Amino acid sequence: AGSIPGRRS
Amino acid sequence: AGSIPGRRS
Amino acid sequence: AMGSMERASLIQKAKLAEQAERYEDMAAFMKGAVEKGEELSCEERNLLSVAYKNVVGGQRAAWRVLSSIEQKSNKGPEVREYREKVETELQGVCDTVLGLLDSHLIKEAGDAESRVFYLKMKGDYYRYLAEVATGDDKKRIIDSARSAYQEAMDISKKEMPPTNPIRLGLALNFSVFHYEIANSPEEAISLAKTTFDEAMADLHTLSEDSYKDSTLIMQLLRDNLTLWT
Amino acid sequence: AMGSMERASLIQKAKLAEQAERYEDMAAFMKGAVEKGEELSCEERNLLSVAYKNVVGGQRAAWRVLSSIEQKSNKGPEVREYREKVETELQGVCDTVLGLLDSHLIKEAGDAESRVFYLKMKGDYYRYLAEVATGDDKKRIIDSARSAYQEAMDISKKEMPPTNPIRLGLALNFSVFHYEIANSPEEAISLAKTTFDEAMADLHTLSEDSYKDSTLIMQLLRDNLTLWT
Ligand SMILES: *Cc1ccc(S(=O)(=O)N(C)C2CCOCC2)cc1
Ligand SMILES: *Cc1ccc(S(=O)(=O)N(C)C2CCOCC2)cc1
Ligand SMILES: [Cl-]
Ligand SMILES: [Cl-]
Numbered sequence: 116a117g118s119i120p121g122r123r124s
Numbered sequence: 125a126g127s128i129p130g131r132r133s
Numbered sequence: 134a135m136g137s138m139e140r141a142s143l144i145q146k147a148k149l150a151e152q153a154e155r156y157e158d159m160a161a162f163m164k165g166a167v168e169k170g171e172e173l174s175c176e177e178r179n180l181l182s183v184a185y186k187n188v189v190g191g192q193r194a195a196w197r198v199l200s201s202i203e204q205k206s207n208k209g210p211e212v213r214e215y216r217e218k219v220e221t222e223l224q225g226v227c228d229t230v231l232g233l234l235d236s237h238l239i240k241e242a243g244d245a246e247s248r249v250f251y252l253k254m255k256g257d258y259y260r261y262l263a264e265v266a267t268g269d270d271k272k273r274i275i276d277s278a279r280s281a282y283q284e285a286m287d288i289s290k291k292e293m294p295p296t297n298p299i300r301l302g303l304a305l306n307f308s309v310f311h312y313e314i315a316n317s318p319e320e321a322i323s324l325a326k327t328t329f330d331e332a333m334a335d336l337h338t339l340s341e342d343s344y345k346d347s348t349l350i351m352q353l354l355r356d357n358l359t360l361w362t
Numbered sequence: 363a364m365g366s367m368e369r370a371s372l373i374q375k376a377k378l379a380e381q382a383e384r385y386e387d388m389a390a391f392m393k394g395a396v397e398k399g400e401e402l403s404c405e406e407r408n409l410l411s412v413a414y415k416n417v418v419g420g421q422r423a424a425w426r427v428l429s430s431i432e433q434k435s436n437k438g439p440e441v442r443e444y445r446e447k448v449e450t451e452l453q454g455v456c457d458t459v460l461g462l463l464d465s466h467l468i469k470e471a472g473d474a475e476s477r478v479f480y481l482k483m484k485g486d487y488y489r490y491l492a493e494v495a496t497g498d499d500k501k502r503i504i505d506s507a508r509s510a511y512q513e514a515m516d517i518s519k520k521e522m523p524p525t526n527p528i529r530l531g532l533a534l535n536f537s538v539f540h541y542e543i544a545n546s547p548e549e550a551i552s553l554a555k556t557t558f559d560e561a562m563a564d565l566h567t568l569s570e571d572s573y574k575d576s577t578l579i580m581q582l583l584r585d586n587l588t589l590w591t
């Protein structure tokens with residue numbers, strides 16, 4: 116189950 | 125030009 | 134530690150730190166920028182969130198490796214000792230972020246976009262605490278994550294279109310909370326399905342660039358639903 | 363900082379830190395193990411080298427990103443300030459490793475395998491200092507790398523077969539020194555070609571596992587020669 120990557124932006 | 129990776133072992 | 138650096142310089146260095154993949158630095162620069170006391174713009178909020186997600190993402194990945202070795206072990210005290218050290222460092226980063234939100238990002242956030250953003254962050258960082266919690270306060274940690282996500286959800290449904298990327302990412306992460314932390318897979322599936330369907334029905338209103346932004350996160354909802362059903 | 367931890371526990375935690383991809387921790391555990399004062403085994407030497415190569419490898423990658431932005435810039439002082447901060451941290455890690463070799467890994471290393479290993483490390487860490495050096499001591503830094511690699515080379519040719527992986531990796535890295543630091547591309551090409559050919563002629567002596575070990579590094583020599591010719 117994946118959450119928002121949110122590791123670039 | 126690449127040196128010994130040497131990042132695992 | 135960053136009190137003698139200009140706010141604008143801290144922001145600039147955070148962007149450079151991202152380019153250099155120096156996420157610990159990036160987080161320290163953005164902590165410094167928050168402690169200047171001004172509200173953050175949309176871009177600055179994203180820099181703060183990216184910095185800490187990367188830092189805590191590495192700690193979580195390491196904790197899961199060590200927890201797995203330790204479960205197969207129970208050798209010596211070393212695997213548990215090292216897992217504990219990593220856990221305490223992860224807890225410290227989550228406490229730092231929660232502290233920034235509490236002092237005083239949330240209380241000053243009056244627009245729906247900023248308030249939803251920070252409450253989603255609060256739910257996420259209590260969720261990371263819950264992943265490693267065992268003892269007297271674990272139920273309370275889970276409820277703290279739940280409460281933050283639920284307030285964000287109530288604001289987002291009232292104030293944002295169903296395709297807004299923050300609203301979509303909040304629902305994605307809240308559905309993960311339900312599935313992975315709350316032992317509520319049916320609530321997780323229902324939330325992801327309803328979020329996906331209500332966004333689909335609103336895509337016609339969007340420009341090409343916004344369409345790309347919303348459909349990216351919709352696909353993450355679909356990937357979860359595929360795994361969970 | 364690690365003086366109260368057992369040597370064996372430090373070694374165990376370094377291996378766990380590698381599995382968890384926590385290279386800063388890994389380096390601190392192996393520094394602690396070296397400071398116990400005993401010589402290191404072959405495996406322990408590799409753990410020390412892997413830890414620091416990863417740490418300094420990340421710093422070098424970040425320094426090159428920031429140096430590139432700064433060269434396109436010359437905006438504000440921030441890009442130079444941040445490049446300098448990263449540089450000082452990289453220099454500090456290289457000084458730490460050089461200090462471990464000087465106190466007292468090299469002087470206690472009497473077998474050819476250990477002595478060559480540590481002198482190659484010394485050449486490598488002076489080489490990383492040289493990559494960022496500009497001023498009064500830069501020529502001296504380059505000569506310090508050269509001197510360390512040359513002593514290692516003299517021992518390796520006298521005491522190790524031409525297929526020994528340490529001898530091969532030393533020659534690879536010394537050829538990179540010649541090409542990238544010393545402005546001697548012909549010396550680099552000649553060293554890589556002679557090393558490759560002399561290993562090829564010795565492969566018949568090897569077991570299947572050792573054959574795989576030597577041919578892996580030979581292919582790195584071939585990849586460089588392809589780029590340089
Ligand atoms: C939780 C969250 C944060 C930020 C966004 S975003 O609008 O900036 N955006 C569309 C994301 C950027 C990173 O990749 C996924 C999308 C959305 C949700
Ligand atoms: C410089 C150096 C260090 C270690 C070796 S090794 O014998 O341990 N070995 C074969 C390497 C391991 C890492 O990948 C490349 C080979 C060789 C050279
Ligand atoms: Cl406000
Ligand atoms: Cl000895």
